[PDB]
């Protein structure tokens, strides 16, 4: 897609080894935030979005937290509290041909900078302080988009780079998506180390009368530690308490 009306695709109810991506040589730029790429496979996520678009090469610097500019002001922007990853690679072999291939467009005028993740498909004409512009375009009243052209001879800094951002939140259960790992039989009453699609810790796991309502998928104590959880393989309520300890 164009960066104007960049294409969100949701990724859900699935498993994926992320590293199958970046171990291939093609992905010229890659940077994650709030998580480390090589360890992504250990985590699970509430929900995932892949936001996909093409932008001019020297613009890719702007697809990052905080940084801003004529693309990030008006076409797509990422929050300050971002977590996720940004990926982009050269596409002058693909979205570019001898005469230029003008199908790719971007918004260049807007009345205000975007909120984060705002998609604004509005083609409406931008009036820079005019009386009502009737929908003609002219003296100080502009159409807001422009094309890139991307002719193959064009200098590489302006050649098109295809971008994908993955956005995902690492808050605990439910989690429609996980990185792969095989899994164990359960054990209870004895002292164990545990995880639950994340939710790592240690304790004794006990059956409990704790009356979780059907939607509740992990549970916390008055100390705000995780204190009870549901087994994601079987929906049983497991009640945690730490293993016995003290001063000697």
């Amino acid at each position, epitope marked *: 897609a164009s960066v104007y009306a960049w294409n969100r695709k949701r990724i859900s109810n699935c498993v994926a080894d992320y*590293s*199958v991506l970046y*171990n291939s040589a093609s992905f010229s730029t890659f940077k994650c935030y709030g998580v480390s790429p090589t360890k992504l496979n250990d985590l699970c996520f509430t929900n995932v979005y892949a936001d996909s678009f093409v932008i001019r090469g020297d613009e890719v610097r702007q697809i990052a937290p905080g940084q801003t500019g004529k693309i990030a002001d008006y076409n797509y922007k990422l929050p300050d509290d971002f977590t996720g990853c940004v990926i982009a690679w050269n596409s002058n072999n693909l979205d570019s041909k001898v005469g230029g291939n003008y199908n790719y467009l971007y918004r260049l005028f807007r009345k205000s900078n975007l909120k984060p993740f705002e998609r604004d498909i509005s083609t409406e004409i931008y009036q820079a302080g005019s009386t009502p512009c009737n929908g003609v375009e002219g003296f100080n009243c502009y159409f807001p988009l422009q094309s890139y052209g991307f002719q193959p001879t064009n200098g590489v800094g302006y050649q098109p780079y295809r971008v994908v951002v993955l956005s995902f939140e690492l808050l605990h259960a439910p989690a429609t998506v996980c990185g792969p790992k095989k899994s164990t039989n359960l054990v209870k009453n004895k002292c164990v180390n545990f995880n639950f699609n994340g939710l790592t810790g240690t304790g004794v796991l006990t059956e409990s009368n704790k009356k979780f309502l059907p939607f509740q998928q992990f549970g916390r104590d008055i100390a705000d530690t995780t204190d009870a959880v549901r087994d994601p393989q079987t929906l049983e309520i497991l009640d945690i308490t730490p293993c016995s300890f003290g001063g000697v």
Partner: nanobody
Amino acid sequence: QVQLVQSGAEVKKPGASVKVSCKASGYTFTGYYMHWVRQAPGQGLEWMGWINPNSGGTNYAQKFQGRVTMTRDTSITTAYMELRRLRSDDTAVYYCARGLGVGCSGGNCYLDYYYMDVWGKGTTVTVSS
């Protein structure tokens, strides 16, 4: 393109060893095992044994264990095979082929190919009186 420059033709009397060679060319030689295969004239092209260019490591069918040996002069990118004896039945016509190889994924590594891709022209050796 990948190619195997197999050695020339040879002649030997029975009961004297003979040694063909195969110049692996245009490909990463260490990427693939070298397989020998052979065909007496009009019979089954069924001979099998191989050498790993990463190693001194080889295997041969039981009928040839202690009767054939393979080596590789790796910087010259050649594999050699010597038939230790030249039985009068050998009537040799032997080929070299780029065989099994590692081919590690983007993901975890494995011994991928289990398959023979490309064959040299091979050489006749006329092993009889």
